[PDB]
């Protein structure tokens, strides 16, 4: 049964507004003039005015930029001195722009490793979240990297981090508590699979007995 498909509108759109989205028509306009109006969130119930229509032509318009991370989808109902048609469900989908950076769940992550641990030993896990669409885009696909290690002894790279999981592991023998009891790592989480927006955090690794 012929229905209007979901209307997709990207967020963060620039001017000028109003901007046309879709036109709806009732073939009952053949006999006489029809008055169009829409209801729902974004037009009737809050929020208000985001989506409007002009009753003479039936052009569904948007009047201000959208934000997918607030309202991801709208559902409206189009209408036509008497009712002409049973209401039509008009679904509006806000498509994603990469406008949020990955954030670590905390600023400092604590972790501990045993001295003499063999390479591959899991030390700790850092975690970040990105608020963008991680199912239809890469705007939330996070890669983890190590930006620095302090100190650089016995080796410059005592640890590695898994690009996808954030697990930090030992890669080199020689961890010694009496020698170097603490390591500080700056970790970065970037979206677009590591090529996009980033933030940093700190991992503090204590070497135990």
């Amino acid at each position, epitope marked *: 049964d012929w229905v209007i498909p979901p209307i997709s509108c990207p967020e*963060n759109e620039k001017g000028p507004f109003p901007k046309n989205l879709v036109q709806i028509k009732s073939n009952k306009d053949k006999e006489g003039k029809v008055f169009y109006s829409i209801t729902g969130q974004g037009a009737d119930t809050p929020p208000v005015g985001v989506f409007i229509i002009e009753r003479e032509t039936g052009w569904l318009k948007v009047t201000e930029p959208l934000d997918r991370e607030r309202i991801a989808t709208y559902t409206l109902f189009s209408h036509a001195g008497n009712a002409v048609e049973d209401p039509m469900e008009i679904l509006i989908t806000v498509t994603d722009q990469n*406008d*949020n*950076k990955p954030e670590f769940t905390q600023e400092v992550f604590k972790g501990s490793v045993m001295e003499g641990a063999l390479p591959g030993t899991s030390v700790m896990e850092v975690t970040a979240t990105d608020a963008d669409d991680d199912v239809n885009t890469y705007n939330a696909a996070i890669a983890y990297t190590i*930006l620095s290690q302090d100190p*650089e002894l016995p080796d410059k790279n005592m640890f590695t981090i898994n690009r996808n999981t954030g697990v930090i592991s030992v890669v080199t023998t020689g961890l010694d508590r009496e020698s170097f009891p603490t390591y*500080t790592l*700056v970790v970065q989480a970037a979206d677009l699979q590591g090529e996009g*927006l980033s933030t*940093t955090a700190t991992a503090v690794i204590t070497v135990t007995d």
Partner: antibody
């Protein structure tokens, strides 16, 4: 107390090159990216690029590739910026600043005058 | 590149007043905008980072707001020290970029 101390003013003829240095202290040097910012007289601030002191990894603003080279010397907690094939348009104050994103500490600036 | 329009360029006020400085950006940069203060003979001073986070050592009469494309630095109850040059900078993405600046001069 963090402190970024820059090298003194440079007066060079056009066509020459200069290396401006910035020495950091008061914090773990490799923990923060270092940045260079240009400010021409009367003009606004312009970010040139950064370097990761841990591994020398650099990123440049496009219009400074081939004009600016960033290097680092970990043993002395110093970052260097090379400016090549200098012109009067290069005459400016140049700042180093600490930070991977925003710059919570700045140097006092180095003045470059390019004139024959 | 993220272009930033910082307005106004010049602004005259007296101690005790509240003033605002605005930066509009050409891309949605979420919250990642920072404000700096410039004074002769002093290294530049970070006031706010990430839109509204007050930096250590800065009094709370400096406050930031906004997210997306419109940001405001607000300075309440101006002290004589506050009359200076002010810059915003987006720290959202390379290349980092700055607003054109605002000179806060003292009424007379």
């Amino acid at each position: 107390e963090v402190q970024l101390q820059q090298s003194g003013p440079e007066l060079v003829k056009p066509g020459a090159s200069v290396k401006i240095s910035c020495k950091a202290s008061g914090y773990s040097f490799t923990g923060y990216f270092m940045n260079w910012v240009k400010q021409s007289h009367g003009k606004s601030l312009e970010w040139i690029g950064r370097i990761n002191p841990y591994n020398g990894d650099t990123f440049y603003k496009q219009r400074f590739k081939g004009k600016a080279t960033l290097t680092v010397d970990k043993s002395s907690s110093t970052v260097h910026m090379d400016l090549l094939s200098l012109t009067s348009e290069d005459s400016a104050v140049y700042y180093c600043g600490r930070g991977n994103y925003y710059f919570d500490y700045w140097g006092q600036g180095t003045t470059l005058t390019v004139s024959s | 590149d993220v272009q930033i329009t910082q307005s106004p360029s010049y602004l005259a006020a007296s101690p005790g007043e509240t003033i605002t400085i605005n930066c509009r950006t050409s891309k949605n940069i979420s919250k990642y905008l920072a404000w700096y203060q410039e004074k002769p003979g002093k290294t530049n001073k970070l006031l706010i980072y990430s839109g509204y986070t007050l930096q250590s050592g800065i009094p709370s009469r400096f406050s930031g707001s906004g997210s997306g494309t419109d940001f405001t630095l607000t300075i309440s109850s101006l002290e004589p020290e506050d009359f200076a040059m002010y810059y915003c900078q987006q720290h959202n993405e390379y290349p980092y970029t700055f607003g054109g600046g605002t000179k806060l001069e003292i009424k007379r």
